Write a protein that binds this ligand. Structure first.
Ligand SMILES: [Mg+2]
Ligand SMILES: [Mg+2]
Lengths: 50, 59, 287, 159, 167, 191
RNA sequence: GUCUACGGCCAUACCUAGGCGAAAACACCAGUUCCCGUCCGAUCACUGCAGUUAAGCGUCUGAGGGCCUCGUUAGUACUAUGGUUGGAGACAACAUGGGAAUCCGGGGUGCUGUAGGCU
RNA sequence: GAACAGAAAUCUCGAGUAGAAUAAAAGGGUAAAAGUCCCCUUGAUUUUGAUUUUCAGUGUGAAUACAAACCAUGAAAGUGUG
RNA sequence: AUUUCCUCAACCUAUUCUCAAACUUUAAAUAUGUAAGACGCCCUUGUCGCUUAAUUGGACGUGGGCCAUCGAAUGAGAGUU
RNA sequence: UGAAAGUGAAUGCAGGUGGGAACGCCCUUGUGGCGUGCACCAUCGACCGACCCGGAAUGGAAGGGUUUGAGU
């Protein structure tokens, strides 16, 4: 039940499976992509231990 | 009842093999160009080939 | 004249509001075929005021019009034409002048000399068999009507005889007959040398002498006779050819600039606007 | 209830703008078009000749041909599972240059202006555009700018 | 200065309103009175209640200017005893009237040709109205240079020793 | 519940709305009096028919006149039936009013002495209308756009000119001379 | 600077009323033989400079009308996305985002290219 | 305003952003015109390929920009393949 | 009474209540077209029967210099039969 | 190739241009530069037939053409 734009964005993020995780460099282009997939992902600032 | 049109699956079908783009070639046929331009380009190109041939040969 | 009438009003183009530019004709006059790219179309702009004749050779660009060459009938006395500076013959002379000025600028004056001694015969400057084609220009009559014998075609005749290639038919020259579709070179030669003006005065010497004195007052006070007119025009055309260059004037513009600022009104500010608004309300006795 | 005439459903698409009727500005005819130019298509309803179909209104393509009063423009249109090369003959009243094309031209020019200067000074050039970075650290002062404490406001009818 | 009112054009129209032998003899008398060719006004539209012939000549009129226009106006006033009323003068500065039995004017007459009525309408213009009439650079005349009814009445009373009704 | 379908050249064959009179009481009143206004506002998007409005106006006119007279109220009906509801005959059937949330249905300006009376009459009309409505007291003077405190200051300065029921409010726009003559008591202060 | 010819954008340029405009230019303006066209040299055509800034034209002023522009209106209206949110429903609130119009107020009332003239 | 006698038939002067006209529907377009009048005309012609729309990117219809001719019109730039 | 009175209608003006899928000066969100150089950037010179007043231009070329953020992000081997 | 009567395939290295397999050479450690360039595709020409041209009894040779063919 993933609509086409969000499905494509998660593919571009290499987030293809539930509970998968990636590091992303935060810029305006990345931020607007994460806005479209807000219901389908969660993200935040990781510390050094993480 | 007949006449049952819908576009529901048609967009999905188009994207299975994607929206293909045509191959882009270096040269397009001059048959799309103005005939007067095309006729003169034949003579211009013929002279360029002759001049390129002579300069290589005389070198 | 309600506000909705004004609100919805669309102004014509500025040069259409002041009745100067025919944009229908201007588009067809200057619009080059796109596969000729940046080759300019040249117009022979010919305009008449009440006293003088303006001849210009103009091309068009996106940002405005560019004058290749100009000739003004006010410069004719320098070549010896001091009277009738707005007539058919003056139109002819100022057309020949801009033709010689334009050809020098494009470096074709020696190759295309036009007619040295016009005899009023319809002809176009033919292209040299092996050499540059003649400089081509199109007539821009403006808002003047193109009736037979109009002065715009006199200036076009002069420019054509000056070596410029101007496409034209002789259907609007003075003396052309529409019944037989033939051009009488005699009347056309007459107009080129100002004989039509010569015949007017000679008629006026015979009858209504007081009308003659009132009409050609400029020509009388120089003691010019109708026989002289052909000679002055014929000599002026020759002087134009030998030296066509436009002598740039040396009048001091700074004096004109300084003079015109003194008579130039200034615009008020808000601080003064508040001052007069209070004063008028005070003088109204309602504050 | 569906006609397929050429200009069906173009009631607003082919309207001149409000207080923009009448004369066509003559700079449209003095623009120069060359093969390889990127042009925008925008139909002028006042020029019925050389009109492109409404599909091409608002589309951008490359000039492939130049005639006396018109340009041929290459446009790709989706017709199924692929794009199709369309060759539209448009009178130049319905065409204008893409403003980005001069922007791409100037950016490249500034790239080579930077690259040559950086080379002579013996330094890097850094010609790559970047997305808007995260905002940097600053030090907002409060002198003469003390915080104002807000509260949510009580409800009250304003009619 | 150049604020001198003068006659621009005098229009004279037949008021008979008939087509036939009377209409033709109207052209002859219009030609005689003016020295000019009497162009024929047409019927713009046929009417059911009158049956006016479409695109057929019904009325004839001429436009007269120049010094002979003043003479025609002068002989019109003489037969009018130089007496016109206030309401004749139009809001734009024109005035006109209408007189029957054009026999009273100074043209020889016979009882064979017929009796015809002949009107007057004088258009008034200061010099400089060419601005609004020329083809090129056609401007609009200023407010102060336009002609009002009061101005053309005073012009009428300044000469011709005329008087106007005090309604 | 489709898109608005009013009378038009495409919808010429229409019935007339059952309500034609929208103004009541002292319609030709002034600005000094009737200073207090009560509104009946629609709390939800309803489709009040012209029959329901016509019923309400008849009920409001009778009760208000009996209880206070004719010179102490300016009842008016804000909602207008312009949407056409269709039916299949035993084609257009009737006229209804599409009113959004917070649309005033009937507005009555009365004296402050009739504040309680105006509330009660506007309260009774809820039983005639469908949906839910609320009674509120306007913060504006009658049928104006200004607050009571502001209107008092405009009235005390002398910048208000009574024109029938409504009035003219001075503005900083237009020729001064006309503004000066029209407002005699007002002081065009020079700043 | 002003003016004239040809323009570009086509009202911060239009419409209105009233003040000013030295020089030149432009204009109004003086005629009808020739060219030319009209019921009419009004217009259009020619041929001129005796007269006039009065009209055009230019510039300045209106707590002018319109027009342009910036703010208020207003993150209000609307809207992409979200919930096993509320509510019988109508709709509403909230969440991650996008974001007007209109009115009202202040300011403004042509800029500019080429060529040539001008105490 | 003038006639005639209601008739704004006609004629004249002002204002007039198109509120008229443009064959037939509606929408779009158009003001020194695309409307009205006038003058001359047959580009409503012969030939070739390219293109757009409907679309399978087949046919048919309709349409666009050119080319080789031959012409019309205009002083001319141009415009004209209904 | 071709001198007036008002309820009579008509029109003009400024306010005023309320609307539009086949109204509109404005005008979103979402959706949508194109571009983000190596077929790229600067000069020397060649061709032509096209085009220009003209080696003028246009089109196609030749020879040299810019190959180190090769010119937003992210991802990914791709396309034709 | 043309309905047919008929006519019938090299200007050139059996042509030019772009990409390109494989190979060779130079760098200098790069996704290199340089030179040939198979297959294939796009493209500018040439050649044969048809058709449309002018075109100096029978033949159609040189010159052409926006075209046309399931050709070379
Ligand atoms: Mg939602
Ligand atoms: Mg869900």
């Amino acid at each position: 039940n993933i609509p086409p734009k969000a499905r494509k964005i998660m593919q571009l993020l290499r987030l293809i499976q539930i509970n998968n995780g990636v590091f992303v460099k935060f810029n305006k282009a990345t931020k607007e992509m994460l806005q479209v997939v807000e219901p389908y992902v969660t993200y935040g600032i990781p510390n050094l231990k993480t | 009842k007949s006449k049952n049109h819908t576009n529901h699956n048609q967009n999905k079908k188009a994207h299975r093999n994607g929206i293909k783009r045509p191959q882009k070639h270096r040269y397009d046929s001059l048959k799309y160009r103005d005939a007067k331009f095309r006729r003169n380009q034949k003579f211009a190109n013929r002279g360029t080939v002759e001049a390129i041939r002579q300069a290589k040969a005389s070198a | 004249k309600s506000s909705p009438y004004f609100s919805r009003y669309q102004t014509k183009y500025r040069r259409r509001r002041e009745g100067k530019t025919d944009y229908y004709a201007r588009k067809r006059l200057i619009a080059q075929a796109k596969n000729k790219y940046n080759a300019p179309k040249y117009r022979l702009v010919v305009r008449f005021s009440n006293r003088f004749v303006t001849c210009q050779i103009v091309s068009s660009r996106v940002n405005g019009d560019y004058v290749l060459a100009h000739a003004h009938s006010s410069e004719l006395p320098r070549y010896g034409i001091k009277w009738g500076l707005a007539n058919w013959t003056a139109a002819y002379a100022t057309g020949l002048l801009v033709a010689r000025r334009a050809l020098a600028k494009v470096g074709l004056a020696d190759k295309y000399e036009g007619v040295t001694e016009p005899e009023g015969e319809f002809e176009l400057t033919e292209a040299i068999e092996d050499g540059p084609r003649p400089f081509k220009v199109f007539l821009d009559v403006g808002l003047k009507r193109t009736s037979t014998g109009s002065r715009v075609f006199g200036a076009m005749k002069g420019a054509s005889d000056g070596g410029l290639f101007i496409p034209h038919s002789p259907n609007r020259f003075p003396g052309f007959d529409i019944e037989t579709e033939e051009l009488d070179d005699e009347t056309l030669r007459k107009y080129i040398y100002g004989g039509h003006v010569a015949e007017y005065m000679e008629m006026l010497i015979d009858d209504d002498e007081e009308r003659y004195q009132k009409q050609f007052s400029g020509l009388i006070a120089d003691g010019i006779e109708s026989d002289q007119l052909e000679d002055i025009y014929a000599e002026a055309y020759a002087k134009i050819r030998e030296d066509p260059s436009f002598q740039k004037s040396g009048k001091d513009a700074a004096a004109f600039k300084a003079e015109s600022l003194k008579y130039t009104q200034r615009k008020l500010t808000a601080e003064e606007r508040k001052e007069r608004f209070n004063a008028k309300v005070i003088e109204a006795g309602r504050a | 209830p569906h006609s397929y005439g050429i200009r069906a459903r173009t009631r607003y698409t082919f309207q001149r703008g409000f207080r923009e009727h009448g004369q066509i500005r003559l700079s449209t005819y003095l623009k120069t078009y060359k093969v390889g130019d990127i042009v925008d298509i925008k139909v002028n309803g006042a020029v019925q000749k050389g009109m492109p179909h409404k599909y091409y209104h608002g589309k951008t393509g490359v000039v492939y041909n130049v005639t006396q009063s018109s340009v041929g423009v290459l446009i790709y249109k989706v017709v199924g599972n692929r794009y199709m090369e369309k060759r539209v003959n448009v009178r130049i009243e319905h065409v204008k240059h893409s403003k980005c094309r001069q922007d791409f031209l100037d950016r490249v020019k500034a790239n080579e202006a930077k690259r040559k200067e950086a080379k002579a000074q013996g330094k890097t050039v850094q010609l790559r555009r970047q997305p808007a970075p995260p905002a940097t650290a600053h030090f907002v002062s409060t002198e003469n700018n003390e915080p104002v404490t807000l509260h949510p406001v009580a409800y009250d009818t304003t009619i | 200065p150049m604020k001198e009112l003068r006659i621009s054009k005098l229009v004279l129209n037949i008021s008979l309103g008939e087509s036939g032998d009377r209409l033709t003899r109207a052209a002859k008398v219009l030609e005689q009175l003016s020295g000019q060719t009497p162009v024929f006004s047409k019927a713009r539209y046929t009417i059911r209640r009158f049956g006016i012939r479409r695109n057929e000549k019904i009325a004839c009129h001429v436009t007269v200017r120049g010094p002979k226009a003043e003479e025609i106006l002068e002989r019109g006033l003489k037969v009018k005893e130089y007496e016109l009323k206030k309401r004749n003068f139009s809001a734009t500065g024109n005035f006109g009237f209408g007189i029957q039995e054009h026999i009273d004017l100074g043209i020889k007459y016979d009882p064979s040709i017929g009796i015809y009525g002949m009107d007057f309408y004088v258009v008034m213009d200061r010099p400089g109205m060419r601005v609004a009439r020329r083809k090129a650079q056609r401007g609009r005349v200023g407010y102060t240079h336009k002609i009002n009814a009061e101005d053309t009445i005073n012009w009428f009373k300044q000469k011709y020793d005329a008087v106007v009704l005090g309604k | 519940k489709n898109k608005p379908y009013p009378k038009s050249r495409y919808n010429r064959a229409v019935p007339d709305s059952k309500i034609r009179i929208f103004d009541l009481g002292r319609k030709r009143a002034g600005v000094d009096e009737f200073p207090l206004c009560i509104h009946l506002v629609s709390n939800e998007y309803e489709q009040i028919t012209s029959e329901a409005l016509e019923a309400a106006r008849i009920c409001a006119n009778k009760y208000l006149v009996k209880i206070g007279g004719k010179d102490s109220f300016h009842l008016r009906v804000r909602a207008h039936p312009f949407h056409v509801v269709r039916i299949n005959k035993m084609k257009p059937n009737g006229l209804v009013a599409r009113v959004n949330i917070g649309q005033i249905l009937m507005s009555v300006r009365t004296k402050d002495s009739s504040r309680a009376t105006a509330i009660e009459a506007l309260r009774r009309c809820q039983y005639k209308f469908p949906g839910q409505q609320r009674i509120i007291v306007s913060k504006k003077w009658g049928f104006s756009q200004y607050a009571r405190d502001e209107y008092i200051e405009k009235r005390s300065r002398g910048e208000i000119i009574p024109d029938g029921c409504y009035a003219k409010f001075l503005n900083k726009r237009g020729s001064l001379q006309e503004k000066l003559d029209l407002f005699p008591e007002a002081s065009f202060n020079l700043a």
